[PDB]
Write an enzyme that holds these catalytic residues in place. Sequence first.
Site, PDB file in Angstrom:
ATOM      1  N   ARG A 137      32.522 -47.489  79.073  1.00 36.66           N
ATOM      2  CA  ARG A 137      32.801 -46.261  78.330  1.00 36.66           C
ATOM      3  C   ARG A 137      33.054 -46.589  76.872  1.00 36.66           C
ATOM      4  NH1 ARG A 137      38.390 -42.765  79.396  1.00 36.66           N
ATOM      5  NH2 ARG A 137      37.359 -40.636  79.377  1.00 36.66           N
TER       6      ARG A 137
ATOM      7  N   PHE B  42      36.204 -43.809  68.362  1.00 42.64           N
ATOM      8  CA  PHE B  42      37.383 -43.775  69.243  1.00 42.64           C
ATOM      9  C   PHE B  42      37.682 -45.124  69.783  1.00 42.64           C
ATOM     10  CE2 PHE B  42      38.932 -41.940  73.530  1.00 42.64           C
ATOM     11  CZ  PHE B  42      40.253 -42.135  73.168  1.00 42.64           C
TER      12      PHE B  42
ATOM     13  N   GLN C 149      36.057 -49.016  76.092  1.00 42.15           N
ATOM     14  CA  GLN C 149      36.810 -49.173  77.344  1.00 42.15           C
ATOM     15  C   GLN C 149      36.099 -50.044  78.330  1.00 42.15           C
ATOM     16  OE1 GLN C 149      38.603 -45.600  78.942  1.00 42.15           O
ATOM     17  NE2 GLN C 149      38.707 -46.423  81.064  1.00 42.15           N
TER      18      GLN C 149
ATOM     19  N   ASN D 256      44.817 -45.495  81.556  1.00 43.95           N
ATOM     20  CA  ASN D 256      45.507 -44.943  82.705  1.00 43.95           C
ATOM     21  C   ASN D 256      45.137 -43.504  82.910  1.00 43.95           C
ATOM     22  OD1 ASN D 256      47.601 -42.916  81.649  1.00 43.95           O
ATOM     23  ND2 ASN D 256      48.340 -44.801  80.492  1.00 43.95           N
TER      24      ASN D 256
ATOM     25  N   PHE E 268      41.345 -50.505  76.676  1.00 44.53           N
ATOM     26  CA  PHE E 268      40.457 -50.138  75.626  1.00 44.53           C
ATOM     27  C   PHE E 268      40.844 -50.814  74.326  1.00 44.53           C
ATOM     28  CE2 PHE E 268      43.279 -46.780  73.614  1.00 44.53           C
ATOM     29  CZ  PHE E 268      44.108 -46.532  74.654  1.00 44.53           C
TER      30      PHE E 268
ATOM     31  N   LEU F 268      47.688 -40.986  71.431  1.00 46.70           N
ATOM     32  CA  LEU F 268      47.920 -41.798  72.589  1.00 46.70           C
ATOM     33  C   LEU F 268      49.246 -42.515  72.572  1.00 46.70           C
ATOM     34  CD1 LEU F 268      44.335 -43.350  72.984  1.00 46.70           C
ATOM     35  CD2 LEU F 268      45.303 -41.149  73.895  1.00 46.70           C
TER      36      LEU F 268
ATOM     37  N   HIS G 223      49.859 -44.483  76.371  1.00 43.38           N
ATOM     38  CA  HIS G 223      49.167 -45.712  76.809  1.00 43.38           C
ATOM     39  C   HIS G 223      49.926 -46.889  76.218  1.00 43.38           C
ATOM     40  CE1 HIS G 223      45.965 -42.700  77.489  1.00 43.38           C
ATOM     41  NE2 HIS G 223      45.650 -43.548  78.428  1.00 43.38           N
TER      42      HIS G 223
END
Lengths: 164, 165
Positions: free
Chosen positions: A54, A59, A62, A101, A112, A121, A125
């Site tokens: 991903r 951004f 991942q 998560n 990530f 975030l 995270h």
Amino acid sequence: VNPTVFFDIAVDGEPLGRVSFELFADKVPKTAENFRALSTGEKGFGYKGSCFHRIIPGFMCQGGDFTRHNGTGGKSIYGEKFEDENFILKHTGPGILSMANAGPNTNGSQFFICTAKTKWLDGKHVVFGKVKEGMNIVEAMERFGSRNGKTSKKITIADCGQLE
Amino acid sequence: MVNPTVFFDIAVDGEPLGRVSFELFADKVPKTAENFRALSTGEKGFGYKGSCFHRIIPGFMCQGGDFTRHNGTGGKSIYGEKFEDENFILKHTGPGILSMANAGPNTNGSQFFICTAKTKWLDGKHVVFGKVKEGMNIVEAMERFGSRNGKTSKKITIADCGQLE
């Protein structure tokens, strides 16, 4: 000394280069240790040969799902999951390494690498490291992604381990 | 055909709070709508009844739908463990949008979230498939129980659910 680990990244099997990370064992020892051990493979499983499933331009990148290779799997060295250790560290910019998560206290193996500041975030995270060398490799990886994370070339961790 | 509507009866530590109803956009995302509808009726023998909102992030969303593990690590669709992203036609336009949780491309299961704001950064990444029709006040009440990692201060459950006429 905070440990250093590396990933040797490949694109459709062809080596691109090395990304090196500092893990903040001084602040998040349990979370660092997990990532460290998964990177060396010393428990018998871990990141070697896995992919970044991903990649979302602007951004993050991942990965870490070494059991199902798509976001549905992974496991930690402590079990299927482990608790959020703390939220001391923030998602301050490109290069930050943080745990993926789907809810509180569900850390596994997925992680990530931020390619931007991701402030929303913070508190959600667990941040546990940062890229030390090879951010240019992460920027190169990021170009292979899309809005939903689908990559246009297979981006793999051809090798990984601990630097010392 | 008018789109189908479903309801959740929400409880807080077992005490009834109220009802949230949703329009499912079967005219745009029929497969994803159908999944949510069927999980809400329980007709397959599993679904949302009795499950919890395990991640409530106030000002962002209320996430639930993990009826197998109750923590974000589980869930399953009516099509198997996962199904592909149907389309990204619809956007996260404002409060009350229903969208599918995922951990990567083509990983929709049963987990979903109710947005409590316009979430434009999610456009193209999560499949939008419905919206709250009545009970946004109830969704705002649910947010009172959340926090920044989504941990809830009381247990927020779908005590009953189903399809409305």
